[PDB]
Design a protein around this ligand. Sequence first.
Ligand SMILES: OC[C@H](C[C@H]1CCOC1)Nc1ncnc2[nH]ccc12
Length: 167
Amino acid sequence: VNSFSGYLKLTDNVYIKNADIVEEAKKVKPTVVVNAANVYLKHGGGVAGALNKATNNAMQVESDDYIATNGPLKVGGSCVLSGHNLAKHCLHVVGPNVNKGEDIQLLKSAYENFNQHEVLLAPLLSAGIFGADPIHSLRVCVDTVRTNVYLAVFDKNLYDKLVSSFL
Ligand SMILES: OC[C@H](C[C@H]1CCOC1)Nc1ncnc2[nH]ccc12
């Protein structure tokens, strides 16, 4: 039993809700919140901009030190950093950004990072400003993640389409 509330169950391990991931994290304080990161950990917009703003830019400060030491992530890769005031940990995961021409096949690799954590609060990878089809992203999530994932979908209209179109 965990403290996630109001989710629709899609499969044995995937749950979904129309919610703002920032507000969900502040309420639940999950062990792991997933950020929709880029390889430079430059948290400008979308989920990343929102999570960082909620940390008063502490996420960006920590991320800049991480990059200075380690260099950029790979598309499809991840790193674990602090969750600041939102969660114990933040798993920064880089899905492919279709608006950069990146290979959508890398979306499965991106979701594989979730399997290293027993329970996660997460967005749909490569959705929103990353330019991928969210229905496809949800499909890849369900077919790749085996650990317990609680998906927050910001847009109510998209959420309803995701639920009603889910196979
Ligand atoms: O893939 C990133 C998704 C895409 C959007 C497009 C419409 O709904 C989902 N973004 C987010 N999902 C959940 N919480 C969020 N808070 C701020 C941004 C955000």
